[PDB]
Amino acid sequence: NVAHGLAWSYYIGYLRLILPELQARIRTYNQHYNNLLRGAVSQRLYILLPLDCGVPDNLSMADPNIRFLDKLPQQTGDRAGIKDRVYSNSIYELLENGQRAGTCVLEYATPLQTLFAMSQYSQAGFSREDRLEQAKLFCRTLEDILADAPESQNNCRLIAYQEPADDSSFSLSQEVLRHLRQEEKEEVTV
Amino acid sequence: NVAHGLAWSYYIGYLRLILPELQARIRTYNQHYNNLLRGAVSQRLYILLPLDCGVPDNLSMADPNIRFLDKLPQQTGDRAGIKDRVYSNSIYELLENGQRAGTCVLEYATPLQTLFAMSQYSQAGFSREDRLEQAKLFCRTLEDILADAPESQNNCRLIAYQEPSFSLSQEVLRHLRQEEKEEV
Ligand SMILES: Nc1nc(=O)c2ncn([C@@H]3C[C@@H]4COP(=O)(O)O[C@H]5[C@@H](F)[C@H](n6cnc7c(N)ncnc76)O[C@@H]5COP(=O)(O)O[C@H]4C3)c2[nH]1
């Protein structure tokens, strides 16, 4: 299917390359920038999966309480004939009542944006249900790929949610903070 | 259906973004390096499409007569939550016994690597015959998209080939020479 190929594209063309190198870049960032990403919770790549496929290019537009802080050091690699193709990731603070409640490396899964854009060219389903369904198959396929990639998969976390892009009562920052707090609770020995 | 998604992603996420800006970047390069990307033939983006989907990452190690020259100035954009995602392209000289026989911005169609990998990972359920068929469908889908694009998105040449006495540099040079003839 379409989402099946896009999930393999997302792993083969991105996650396979950047997940093994992520901790080294975070360690380099923390050494030179006063250890902003503290603890395992703040050291994963958090991948946003809006199953609505509404994907803004600026996260601050999706929620004012998500604010850009810095970039990790870039990763370069020779890729399909391009010398030093650049892979870059952005660090955000999550604000709660005007105060920083979290810090994480955060981004959208770009292929969900591709699915939506494809519908704009009348080459993929465009309806609310069709966006949700195509995104679900992509997410489940990506989940299965990562479960079969035990060597590098623990460097990322998937954050999927169904609320519409234009839903004004939905807090993306609160959605991320809920995941981060749950991750920290799993660290307690009980 | 795999190829349909990959080809549209290649257009939506790459070609539609960089082709309208490619001439300006080449012009910037040509202004500081003595119109070395000369003639209309050196102004296009050349995209290698090996139909078996075997895509080396290093072009100079694939054929020593394909020699890295320079990066174009890079192009950046905010993309899906990433600030200043970087788009970069490489210029190469094609040599014959030391003589420059052509110069161009040259690369492989990266999504062919996804088709190849799916044919090697048993979890993907994707055979070599599937790979070869989707590779042809990817090429045809991309050709259709580019044919429907504005003249601002049209400045690229797809070089599709089957490798059976094979020179990759000669494969490119044959297309560059044909274009030079259709100029005059
Ligand atoms: N966050 C994030 N940062 C990244 O740096 C990144 N790189 C990959 N990916 C993800 C894996 C998908 C497939 O990656 P890939 O196998 O390279 O296929 C590309 C390639 F053929 C071409 N292309 C695009 N950009 C470029 C470029 N700079 N240079 C050359 N060619 C370029 O367009 C296709 C579709 O790209 P898209 O962004 O839509 O989907 C990406 C999303 C990324 N994600």
- Looking up residue B154, the CATH number of its domain turns out to be 3.40.50.12100
Please tell me if the CB atom of residue A113 comes closer than 6 angstroms to any atom of ligand 1. no
**Which residues are CB-contacts of B4 (< 8 A; sequence separation ≥ 6)?**
A2, A123, B137, B141
Give the whole-angstrom CA distance, residue B61 versus residue B74: 23
Q: How was this structure determined?
A: X-ray
Beta strands in A38-147 (DSSP E): 45-50, 66-71, 75-79, 82-87, 90-96, 99-108
Token readout for A53 is 């496929």
B87 lines ligand 1 (CB under 6 A): yes
Residue B116 C-alpha from the chain's centroid? 17
In chain B, which ranges are E strands? Answer: 45-50, 66-71, 75-79, 82-87, 90-96, 99-108, 156-161
Same domain, A77 and A168: yes
Counted residue by residue, chain B has a size of: 184
Same domain for A75 and A127, yes or no, is yes
Examine the domain organization and report whether B86 and B166 are in the same domain.
yes
CA distances from B73 to A72, A122, B6, B102, B152 (A): 21, 33, 26, 20, 19
Size of chain A in residues: 190
- Do A86 and B88 make contact, defined as CB atoms within 8 angstroms? yes
A4 and B2 Cβ atoms separated by less than 8 Å: yes
Place of tokens 């003249």: B151
Please check whether residues A21 and A67 belong to one and the same domain.
no
Task: Report the domain count for chain A.
Answer: 2
Cβ distance A1 to B3 less than 8 Å, yes or no, reads: no
**Residue B168 is part of which domain span?**
42-179
Identify the residue whose tokens are 């790549």.
A45
Amino acid at residue number B180 = E
Pairing of strands B90-96, B99-108: antiparallel
CA gap A83, A85 in Å, rounded = 6
Residue of B nearest to A86 (CA): B86
- The answer to the question of residue A188 being in a domain is no
Task: State the resolution, in angstroms.
Answer: 1.7
Considering the domain architecture, whether residues B115 and B68 belong to the same structural domain is answered as yes
Asked whether residue A92 falls in the same domain as residue A21, the answer is no
DSSP code at position A190: -
For residue A82, what are the β-bridge partners?
A79
- A70 and A160: one domain? yes
For chain B, how big is the Rg over CA atoms in Å?
17
Looking at the structure, tell me whether residues B90 and B133 fall in a common domain: yes
Tell how far the Cα of B105 is from the centroid of ligand 1, in angstroms. 18
A31 and A59: one domain?
no
**Encoding tokens for residue A66?**
């998500």
H-helix segments, A40-127: 59-62, 110-120
Find the helix or strand (DSSP H, E) in which B74 lies.
none
Mutate to test the interface with A, among B4, B8, B121, B159 (most CBs of A within 10 A): B8
Examine residue A115 and state whether it is found in any structural domain, yes or no: yes
B184 belongs to a structural domain? no
Same-domain status, B50 and B122:
yes
Please give the angle made by the CA atoms of B75, B77 and B79, to the nearest 5 degrees: 140
Alpha-carbon separation of residue A171 from A128, A177, B127, B144 (angstroms): 20, 10, 44, 41
